């Protein structure tokens, strides 16, 4: 045999070491063709759905998402008691390779590492293909493709068209480094950017009390107050809360909503040559403010999927939604105004004008939280190349790299009915960032409910089938701000 | 808006009777049901719970068993069959649709949890004697 | 869940009822609905949510959470507001939702 | 014992059959019939 | 503690006493002393 | 007379295997 | 000095769904109190909606001039259909401004009136950035939405420049 | 420079931590909510820059500066309690407290509370010292002085308030006119806000209504007025049976290009502020003016070691509630 | 230190979120310090 079984954790003190083995099995596509792909192919009959491009026979393999590489022991052993963490050094193994004609035994299987990220990178954009949350799973290597330049559903001058190792006692590896990249924080403000204040001392700044003297005409004057304990929201702030776009508020409760279609009409959106795209997940913002619980932004939040669901028009109860609810120290929420900005000059003849501002760009001063990472979520996206960036960190989560870890292609040398199964063994090595809080009392934290179940989160049933319960974040640890 | 009930009578010990539930005026489907049991003098007792589609039912422990509940979508109508009754399950018998969620679970959506019933019917009589 | 067998009050004054809960049932930070019925007919959802009237539902009708155990203050008592409440909460370790023990608000006028 | 001789853990590892030309996530549930022998010294 | 390990135990013992001071019945009392041992 | 004879530590280091909990606290002692 | 071969919405793969899913319908339909949340996967078919690790960069929308004269309005808006700033009470124009595609593709003949191959990441100059929820729709009043003319900068943001005085701070000091 | 004072030192809450909140002033406003703590430290706040009986000789004081930046930073909240700015004046140490999350003015579980005296700090008599020496971290300068490719700074509009009160309309605008930024459901005035000029060139009676605190009409060269636009914009498509159609610009996200001016300093202004610990910010300097920072000058946390008074003979377990009255005094130099 | 592999995560101690009057472990407004609940040691789990 060319290689051995690694799954386990190494907790080595600031470090964690994750190895991750799978069984997989590699089909045959295109029937070992290059093909166009288009939406007329489907038909493609709006606009904001027009793409172009083409299939290829290879796979690749997709390791991005957290569940991977982290048991959900793992994940929460980590969870609770680190501030951040951030991955260092890849490491990938594809040993005991089979091959079959359809079924008996044979062939070589060509793989290769894209090292100058000139093929397109499909990896960051949270498609399906990862590998098996529990480890007895064979996962089916998915299919690559890609897409590039289109005017409807027909291609353009510029749009553009795309040495590999060969192996059955052979195997494949490399080494991956993860260039330099900010820990992805892991924790909650124990304050909110606008209570910072001292609540015992006075400012000796001064805000505008009474612009009139009583009721009555020519009653015109001002008056000054100090800035103080007893009326903290007119305090002078050194920081803003962080970039806003709105959504609409939607309500979980099926009561509240509008009886009406708006999914589309609705939503938020940005425009790109023509062609409207939802805004989503959007920029970080808290999902609901406290005090309401039930609503969630339309598109401001990551909806994952519970087992055995998939496809269309699936019920309420069956997706599971992310929770956004930590930001709401530093962030706006997602589904209300920024703030007010004045329209007009007060004049003696005109009264003062505001207007509600529903999404701001940067302005200085302005601090956030990016959106947190979930044991189902991506890891890692590909900042794109451009002239400049800001904040290259992913939307949806996660760490942005100009060199993120690169593609594994692979497919089968062709005909014969072939297909190719396999082991993977990937290691990825974290860096933790312990917690040094003096907070006195006891934290939340992740735990299983005691009470007695039917059966187990987190592990398989009746029917051996395996599913998570429900979404995990990072975040539950509290720093000072 | 309006929820029915019927189906009731006088069952005496042991056998069974089906119990069903018709309602019209909102969607049947965005809905889940419950049923809800109250004796003459007693608090009101909470019978079953059944989700959006009847995917997952989870009765209460001391009917468990010897209840079935069954939803068409088609016709709009919930169905409660039971099955050996004793005369401790003589009372009013309530339909009920839940909406409100129990507010930190209401992401995760469960079948569960959906104990708040807006509106519910207008009751039937089921008595349990020899 | 366990309510007062009887509670008694006043017109024109300001009532309470409070449903303490266990472990199983409050601890977890599940909602505590409440309920009311007049005598005799089907009873109607009072307080959606922890503190929330909906429409078409008295102000002075206010109640809340704390701790384990839901509170309840009915302000400005009416003869209307004479009748039976009814405190649900989940109950975790059960799996299913648990009413309370039952309460007649009593309108001593 | 505190620490007896340790359990020792063997399994065949599954081959799955042919698979379905286009993608499907859902976990392989087709394998192939087998079973396998050897010799052990104690 | 109780959330990440499986046993704990206590190795060593370190106790200081210091910054003594002595009232009257109240102001200092300078010259009083105070009676400190341990029995090992 | 004019001289601190010690200082005030209370607080807790979490280091390998070992933790080490300091706790100062002030006394009062009649006779 | 170079062109790309993607659109910055087109970066995923054609051929595998997402793992996310959005919401696909607010009504049941065709009937008063008939309202359901029904989600649905996020995939090839619609493309639309799929979740996005990064948007397209900044825009100050810029008013548009075609080179025929009918096409255009006939009165005479130079002055006063531009998109200036106001600097010590001194109206100045915006030229060239940022960079934005100067045409939507398939359309060679308008052109941004102070301002094409940064049309992949760059809003088009005389489109408005997107759309805003403007309200909470609940029930008594539908969703409503806003248009956003000029966008500043967002976490997420990519963009090109067109093809430093001594100040506290500047934001990507390339000249306009 | 150098600066030498001289301060005294009281007993705050009699040396004790006592949970504080708006339902003990009342609170009626949403925006007020608060819930947080008081401590019986006092701390030490030269931030500004013109700051640039008997006796117990047994009895101690307690001090230490906190270098991690673990408890609440309240110096770059622009408080009051700075040195004097005259060397000859004595003042006051004002009393350390803190704030938390809260939900109305209750306190959610992920509130933090700490205690103080859990930190290790030194402990003096009459005749010991203290002393310290913090090192700056890096920042720029703080400049003092007066077809384009650059565009002015950006823009959140103030409204415009007239220095005689007849230009000033008749109503109560303070707050309903005024601009604010929401979180979480409160609105909080905006104050200052970004930097902007605090007039047009020509009218000197005019200032921001929340912008200032002062006129920072220096900077009218780089920054477009705070009472006015950023500019304006086509709001439309014209064609030949639609004119074109333009809207107003009153707030201004940053853009490529643009340039801008800080906040200028005061003698009476604030020095530095702690840039928050997040995952991302812009242009970090502090809106109130001054040089930001990461890690500025660390707390100086001080109290007074509480002397008990006579216990009781029989042994009672409640911490003992009777304590000396004490106070210090002593010279700082920094 | 515990070495487990146990797959499915752990019962540990939590600071329940939601609103209140006080925060446990802290300080009433009188500043009376005050432990609420008796807390354990056992919550991570081992096999007999």
Not at chain 4, 12 to 32: C, G, Q, R
Request: proline fraction near 6%.
């Amino acid at each position: 045999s060319s290689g051995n079984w690694h799954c386990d954790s190494q907790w080595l003190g600031d470090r964690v070491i994750t190895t991750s083995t799978r069984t997989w099995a590699l089909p045959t596509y295109n029937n070992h063709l290059y093909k166009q792909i288009s939406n007329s192919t489907s038909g493609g009959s709006s606009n904001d759905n027009a793409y172009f491009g083409y299939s290829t026979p290879w796979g690749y393999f997709d390791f991005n998402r957290f569940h991977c590489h982290f048991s959900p022991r793992d994940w929460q052993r980590l969870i609770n008691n680190n501030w951040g963490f951030r991955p260092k050094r890849l490491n990938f193994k594809l040993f005991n390779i089979q091959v079959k004609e359809v079924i008996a035994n044979n062939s070589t299987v060509q793989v290769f590492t894209d090292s100058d990220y000139q093929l397109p990178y499909v990896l960051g954009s949270a498609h399906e293909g990862c590998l098996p949350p529990f480890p007895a799973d064979v996962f089916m290597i998915p299919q690559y493709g890609y897409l590039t330049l289109n005017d409807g559903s027909q291609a353009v001058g510029r749009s553009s068209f795309y040495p590999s190792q060969m192996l059955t006692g052979n195997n494949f590896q490399f080494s991956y480094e993860f260039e330099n990249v900010p820990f992805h924080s892991s924790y909650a403000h124990s304050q909110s950017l606008d209570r910072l204040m001292n609540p015992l001392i006075d400012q000796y700044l001064y805000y505008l009390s009474k612009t009139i003297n009583g009721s009555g005409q020519n009653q015109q004057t001002l008056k000054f107050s100090v800035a103080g304990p007893s009326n903290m929201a007119v305090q002078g702030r050194n920081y803003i809360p962080g970039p806003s776009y709105r959504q609409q508020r939607v309500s979980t409760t099926v009561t509240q909503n509008n009886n009406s279609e708006f999914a589309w009409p609705g939503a938020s959106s940005w425009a790109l040559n023509g062609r409207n795209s939802l805004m989503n997940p959007g920029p970080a913002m808290a999902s609901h403010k406290e005090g309401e619980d039930r609503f969630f932004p339309l598109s401001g939040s990551l909806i994952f999927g519970k087992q055995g669901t998939g496809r269309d028009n699936v019920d309420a109860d069956k997706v599971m939604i992310t929770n956004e609810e930590e930001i709401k120290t530093t962030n706006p929420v997602a589904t209300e105004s920024y703030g007010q900005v004045a329209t007009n000059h007060q004049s003696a003849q005109a009264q003062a004008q505001t207007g509600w501002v529903q999404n701001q760009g940067i302005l200085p001063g302005m601090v956030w939280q990016d959106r947190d990472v979930y044991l189902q979520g991506p890891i890692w996206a590909k900042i794109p190349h451009t002239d400049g960036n800001f904040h290259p960190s992913p939307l949806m989560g996660g760490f942005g790299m100009k060199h993120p870890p690169p593609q594994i292609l692979i497919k089968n040398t062709p005909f014969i009915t072939q297909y190719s199964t396999g082991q993977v063994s990937v290691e990825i090595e974290w860096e933790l960032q312990k917690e040094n809080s003096k907070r006195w009392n006891p934290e939340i934290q992740y735990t299983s409910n005691y009470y007695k179940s039917n059966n187990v989160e987190f592990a398989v049933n009746t029917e051996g089938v395996y599913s998570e319960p429900r979404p995990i974040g990072t975040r539950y640890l509290t720093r000072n701000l | 808006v309006q929820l029915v009930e019927s189906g009731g009578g006088v069952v005496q010990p042991g056998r069974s009777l089906r119990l069903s539930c018709a309602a019209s005026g909102f969607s049947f489907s965005s809905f889940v049901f419950h049923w809800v049991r109250q004796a003459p003098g007693k608090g009101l007792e909470w019978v079953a719970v059944i989700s959006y589609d009847g995917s997952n039912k989870n009765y209460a422990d001391s009917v468990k068993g010897r209840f079935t509940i069954s939803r068409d979508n088609s016709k709009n109508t919930l169905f409660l069959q039971m099955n050996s009754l004793s005369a401790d399950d003589t009372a009013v018998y309530y339909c009920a649709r839940g909406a409100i969620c129990s507010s930190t679970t209401c992401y995760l959506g469960d079948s569960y949890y959906f104990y708040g019933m807006d509106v519910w019917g207008q009751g039937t009589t089921v008595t349990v004697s020899s | 869940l366990t309510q007062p067998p009887s509670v008694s009050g006043a017109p024109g004054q300001r009532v309470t009822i409070s449903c303490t809960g266990s472990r199983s049932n409050i601890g977890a930070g599940y909602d505590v609905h409440w309920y009311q019925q007049l005598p005799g007919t089907a009873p109607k959802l009072l307080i959606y949510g922890n503190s929330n009237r909906p429409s078409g539902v008295p102000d002075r009708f206010s109640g809340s959470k704390s701790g384990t155990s839901a509170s309840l203050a009915i302000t400005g008592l009416q003869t209307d507001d004479e009748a039976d409440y009814y405190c649900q909460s989940y109950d975790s370790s059960l799996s299913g939702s648990v009413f309370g023990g039952g309460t007649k608000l009593t309108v001593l006028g | 014992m505190k620490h007896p001789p340790p359990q020792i853990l063997i399994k065949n590892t599954p081959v799955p059959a042919d698979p379905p030309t286009a993608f499907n996530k859902d976990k392989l549930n087709s394998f192939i019939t087998q079973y396998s022998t050897g010799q052990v010294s104690v | 503690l109780i959330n990440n390990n499986w046993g704990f135990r206590p190795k060593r013992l370190n106790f200081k006493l210091f910054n003594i001071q002595v009232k009257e019945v109240i102001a200092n009392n300078l010259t009083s002393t105070v009676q400190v041992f341990t029995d090992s | 007379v004019g001289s601190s004879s010690g200082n005030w530590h209370c607080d807790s280091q979490w280091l390998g295997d070992r933790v080490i909990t300091t706790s100062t606290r002030t006394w009062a002692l009649p006779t």
